[PDB]
């Protein structure tokens, strides 16, 4: 809130009579979508591995709604613009287990895979 409203991007300052005049350019949403999000994702393994998103959300790509729990295919989106993409080691991090995380048994991301090559 210190540099204007919204999400601050850039600011400029000019001279004014008796002082300084400031223009804060901020990012402002106009339309939005309602997305279904996960807190994190688990492995059902031993020892169990869990991931959480970096700067964004694990979402469903709900363009074709009313699907099943194996059709719970999860994607990553950034927090400021809805555009789903595959979950990788670039946009997730390993965390300790939490009871709110969804337990996945099929369609696993590559960070959540039992690594046998």
């Amino acid at each position: 809130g210190f540099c204007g409203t919204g999400t601050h991007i850039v600011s400029f300052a000019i001279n004014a009579p008796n002082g300084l005049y400031f223009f804060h350019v901020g990012y402002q949403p106009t339309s939005h979508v309602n997305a279904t999000a996960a807190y994190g994702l688990c492995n059902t393994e031993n020892p169990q591995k869990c991931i959480a998103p970096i700067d964004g959300y694990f979402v469903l790509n709900q363009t074709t709604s009313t699907v099943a729990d194996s059709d719970q295919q999860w994607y990553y989106t950034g927090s400021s613009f809805f555009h789903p993409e595959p979950i990788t080691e670039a946009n997730s991090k390993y965390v300790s287990m939490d009871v709110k995380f969804e337990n996945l048994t099929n369609r696993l991301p590559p960070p959540l895979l039992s690594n046998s090559t």
Binding site: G6, Y27, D55, Y57
Partner: protein, 48 residues
């Protein structure tokens, strides 16, 4: 506890800009903005 010295001495107390309903609405806005409210990096998403 009235201020009757207004009408004798010649000054006036002006009422505030908002009424108690609007101040109550402001603090309920503050109370309801606590859970969630841009869970992540920016300020553009709102998680419930």
């Amino acid at each position: 506890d009235l201020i009757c010295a207004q009408y004798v001495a010649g000054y006036k107390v002006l009422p505030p800009l908002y009424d108690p309903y609007m101040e109550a609405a402001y603090t309920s806005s503050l109370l309801g903005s606590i859970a969630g409210a841009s869970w992540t990096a920016g300020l553009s998403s709102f998680a419930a």
